[PDB]
């Protein structure tokens, strides 16, 4: 019932390591008793617990031209539009109307797709570099 029992079980099973039990108890508290907890090696000397919230996937931007922060070579947008496409975006006609809507509403646009081919990608980089329109692929 209590998280203290969770910490005690984790401590006993970890050869009496209090820190491991505390870390596991904290992770279970912050992601749920039936959440997803993964274990991986660390490059530091001490155990660390990191929580990934919201949605996050291991796919970065295609062309490093949409960077607008440069503090960590990252692109942040607030209150952004999202365009999700099952198929690749390659044609000019398949990308222009979304950009038109984003520009009219004056909001940044994230384009999540399988890939962005030469024509649409070139249009995106050109508009980002010249006009300054906020967009990312």
């Amino acid at each position: 019932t209590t998280p203290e029992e969770i910490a005690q079980v984790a401590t006993i099973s970890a050869n009496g390591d209090k820190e491991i039990g505390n870390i596991i108890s904290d992770a279970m508290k912050k992601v749920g008793r039936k959440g997803v907890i993964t274990v991986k090696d660390g490059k530091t000397l001490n155990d660390e617990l990191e929580i990934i919230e919201g949605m996050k996937f291991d796919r970065g931007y295609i062309s490093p031209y949409f960077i607008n922060t440069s503090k960590g070579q990252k692109c942040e947008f607030q209150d952004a539009y999202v365009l999700l496409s099952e198929k690749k975006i390659s044609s000019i006609q398949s990308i222009v109307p979304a950009l038109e809507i984003a520009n009219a509403h004056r909001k940044p646009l994230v384009i999540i797709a399988e890939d962005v081919d030469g024509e649409a990608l070139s249009t995106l980089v050109l508009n980002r570099l010249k006009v300054g329109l906020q967009v990312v692929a």
Binding site: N103, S122, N127
Partner: protein, 100 residues
């Protein structure tokens, strides 16, 4: 046959200049140069004397200098005049003209 700057097409060929390509969309989205293909809209700037298929006099071309015409996809001939680009077509290759 109305001529152009030190040039005159022979027979039924018509010399035109393609309209400028569309750089930006209505909402301001700009297009790359390598895109947008080739412009099929042109302006007639030179017309030849006419064909000789019919016996007797000369039959002039249907178009006149200053007409806005729609070019076919293929069939033009590149001509360089004062470092600028023009295209020589046949009279019958022109698809139509924008009446206005």
């Amino acid at each position: 046959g109305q001529a152009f700057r030190k040039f005159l097409p022979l027979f039924d060929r018509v010399l035109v200049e393609r309209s400028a390509a569309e750089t930006v969309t209505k909402g301001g989205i700009m297009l790359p140069e390598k895109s947008q293909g080739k412009v099929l809209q042109a302006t007639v700037v030179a017309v030849g004397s006419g064909s000789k298929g019919k016996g007797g006099e000369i039959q002039p071309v249907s178009v006149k200098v200053g007409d806005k015409v729609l070019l076919p996809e293929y069939g033009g001939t590149k001509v360089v005049l004062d470092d600028k680009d023009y295209f020589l077509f046949r009279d019958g290759d022109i698809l139509g003209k924008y009446v206005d």
